Design an enzyme around this catalytic site. Structure first.
Site, PDB file in Angstrom:
ATOM      1  CE  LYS A  20      -3.761  -2.069   0.015  1.00 47.76           C
ATOM      2  NZ  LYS A  20      -4.240  -1.320  -1.045  1.00 47.76           N
ATOM      3  CE  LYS A  39       8.477  -0.585   4.035  1.00 45.21           C
ATOM      4  NZ  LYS A  39       7.998  -1.649   5.164  1.00 45.21           N
ATOM      5  CD  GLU A  88      19.799  -8.674   7.982  1.00 38.05           C
ATOM      6  OE1 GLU A  88      19.822  -7.656   8.885  1.00 38.05           O
ATOM      7  OE2 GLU A  88      20.213  -9.867   8.365  1.00 38.05           O
ATOM      8  CE1 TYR A  89      17.018 -10.702  -0.858  1.00 38.21           C
ATOM      9  CE2 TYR A  89      19.512 -11.183  -0.922  1.00 38.21           C
ATOM     10  CZ  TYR A  89      18.165 -11.582  -1.202  1.00 38.21           C
ATOM     11  OH  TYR A  89      17.826 -12.738  -2.185  1.00 38.21           O
ATOM     12  CB  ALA A  90      15.731 -11.697   5.023  1.00 35.76           C
ATOM     13  CG  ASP A 133       1.909  -5.284  12.863  1.00 36.99           C
ATOM     14  OD1 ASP A 133       1.054  -6.079  13.006  1.00 36.99           O
ATOM     15  OD2 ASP A 133       2.474  -4.754  11.891  1.00 36.99           O
ATOM     16  CD  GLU A 137       0.473 -10.409   6.155  1.00 39.65           C
ATOM     17  OE1 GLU A 137      -0.692 -10.847   5.269  1.00 39.65           O
ATOM     18  OE2 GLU A 137       0.538  -9.028   6.405  1.00 39.65           O
ATOM     19  CG  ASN A 138       4.979  -7.635   9.928  1.00 42.47           C
ATOM     20  OD1 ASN A 138       4.952  -7.152   8.812  1.00 42.47           O
ATOM     21  ND2 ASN A 138       4.056  -7.126  10.777  1.00 42.47           N
ATOM     22  CG  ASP A 151       6.739  -3.600   8.792  1.00 38.46           C
ATOM     23  OD1 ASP A 151       6.065  -3.829   8.011  1.00 38.46           O
ATOM     24  OD2 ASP A 151       7.422  -2.829   9.067  1.00 38.46           O
TER      25      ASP A 151
HETATM   26  O1  NHI Z   1       5.270  -9.552   2.327  1.00 39.76           O
HETATM   27  C1  NHI Z   1       6.096  -9.269   1.430  1.00 39.76           C
HETATM   28  O2  NHI Z   1       5.803  -9.737   0.064  1.00 39.76           O
HETATM   29  C2  NHI Z   1       7.121  -8.475   1.849  1.00 39.76           C
HETATM   30  C3  NHI Z   1       7.520  -8.095   3.126  1.00 39.76           C
HETATM   31  C4  NHI Z   1       8.662  -7.629   3.268  1.00 39.76           C
HETATM   32  C5  NHI Z   1       9.789  -7.399   2.536  1.00 39.76           C
HETATM   33  N1  NHI Z   1      10.934  -6.860   2.633  1.00 39.76           N
HETATM   34  C6  NHI Z   1      12.127  -7.613   2.688  1.00 39.76           C
HETATM   35  C7  NHI Z   1      13.451  -6.863   3.305  1.00 39.76           C
HETATM   36  C8  NHI Z   1      14.346  -7.442   3.216  1.00 39.76           C
HETATM   37  N2  NHI Z   1      14.677  -8.699   2.689  1.00 39.76           N
HETATM   38  C9  NHI Z   1      13.439  -9.203   1.989  1.00 39.76           C
HETATM   39  N3  NHI Z   1      13.452 -10.636   1.649  1.00 39.76           N
HETATM   40  C10 NHI Z   1      12.821 -11.059   0.718  1.00 39.76           C
HETATM   41  C11 NHI Z   1      13.440 -11.867  -0.324  1.00 39.76           C
HETATM   42  C12 NHI Z   1      12.730 -12.597  -1.180  1.00 39.76           C
HETATM   43  C13 NHI Z   1      11.446 -12.539  -1.167  1.00 39.76           C
HETATM   44  C14 NHI Z   1      10.428 -13.029  -2.312  1.00 39.76           C
HETATM   45  O3  NHI Z   1       9.460 -13.570  -1.871  1.00 39.76           O
HETATM   46  O4  NHI Z   1      11.052 -13.371  -3.474  1.00 39.76           O
HETATM   47  C15 NHI Z   1      10.596 -11.662  -0.198  1.00 39.76           C
HETATM   48  C16 NHI Z   1      11.493 -11.053   0.729  1.00 39.76           C
HETATM   49  N4  NHI Z   1      12.178  -8.835   2.144  1.00 39.76           N
HETATM   50  C17 NHI Z   1       9.533  -7.786   1.140  1.00 39.76           C
HETATM   51  C18 NHI Z   1       8.255  -8.475   0.806  1.00 39.76           C
END
Ligand code: NHI
EC number: 2.7.11.1
Length: 266
Positions: A20, A39, A88-90, A133, A137-138, A151
């Site tokens: 959103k 972001k 940081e990238y997860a 929260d 999703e977080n 988040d």
């Molecule tokens: O709810 C959401 O769609 C969502 C929520 C938080 C978000 N933020 C971050 C921040 C850091 N690192 C990541 N990693 C990540 C890697 C791969 C994928 C995938 O699905 O390919 C999704 C997330 N996401 C991204 C997406």
């Protein structure tokens, strides 16, 4: 950290998530080739909705936390039309997608996630930072599959009385919050119980068709267990889902719970 970043310092990659307010992109910092997540929040959209304040908090709070199970916020910057969060990238995505993929987790993966989350929350609470929260999703997943609280949008310091307009579902909110009352860190312990149940069952314990119905189930703490949820699991979840905040256990007791001990690998 020291320097001020600009968009020109990054090569944006593919979308990770579209929401959103903003989208989350894979990105690489030109000079060091550092891979991270960017972001992008539109602002005008923030300006509407009066969310400018919460963002200062989220950034302020999250950028000062350093924990292996807490996603890092390295810094931020903005331009005329938006704000950027350097995160940081997860690599393994959201816990939500894992759950939606497997349907439900086994006791071992659940026990391990609860553990990592309790440590993470243990650290937040040592700073009176309450998350409020916690939902799949977080929660993100690191390269080694470890859970990362990600988040901090609704994060605030405890104790708090903030009567913030609840817009998403109430599924993870405790009785004291859905009733506009004061609350502290015990809020996260309830969410943890809701989470533990969703992980094993596949659906949150108070799920309903209407906000109004879910509201009733939460305030009356009406939940039931499917036959496959084991005694030890039911036990931990029951100790956590207590209407009276003071009756919910301490994260220490959670970490030392027999069931969390027999099944957790971390
Ligand atoms: O709810 C959401 O769609 C969502 C929520 C938080 C978000 N933020 C971050 C921040 C850091 N690192 C990541 N990693 C990540 C890697 C791969 C994928 C995938 O699905 O390919 C999704 C997330 N996401 C991204 C997406």
């Amino acid at each position: 950290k020291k320097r001020q970043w600009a968009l020109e310092d990054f090569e944006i990659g593919r979308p990770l998530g579209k929401g959103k307010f903003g989208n989350v992109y894979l990105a690489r910092e030109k000079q060091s080739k550092f891979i991270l997540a960017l972001k992008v929040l539109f602002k005008a959209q923030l300006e509407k909705a009066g969310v400018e304040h919460q963002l200062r908090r989220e950034v302020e709070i999250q950028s000062h936390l350093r924990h292996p199970n807490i996603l890092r916020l390295y810094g931020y910057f903005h331009d005329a039309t938006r704000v950027y969060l350097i995160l940081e990238y997860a690599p393994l995505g959201t816990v939500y997608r894992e759950l939606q993929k497997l349907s439900k987790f086994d006791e071992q993966r659940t026990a391990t996630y609860i553990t990592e989350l309790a440590n993470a929350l243990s650290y937040c609470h040592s700073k009176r930072v309450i998350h409020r929260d916690i939902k799949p999703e977080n929660l993100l997943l690191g390269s080694a599959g470890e859970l990362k609280i990600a988040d901090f949008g609704w994060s605030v310091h405890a104790p708090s009385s903030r009567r913030d307009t609840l817009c998403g579902t109430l599924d993870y909110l405790p009785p004291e919050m859905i009733e506009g009352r004061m609350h502290d860190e015990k809020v996260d312990l309830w969410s943890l119980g809701v989470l533990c149940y969703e992980f094993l069952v596949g659906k949150p314990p108070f799920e309903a068709n209407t906000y109004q119905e879910t509201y009733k189930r939460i305030s009356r703490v009406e939940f039931t267990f499917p036959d496959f949820v084991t005694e030890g699991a039911r036990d931990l979840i029951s100790r956590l889902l207590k209407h009276n905040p003071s009756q919910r256990p301490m994260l220490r007791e959670v970490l030392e719970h027999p069931w969390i001990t027999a099944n957790s690998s971390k």
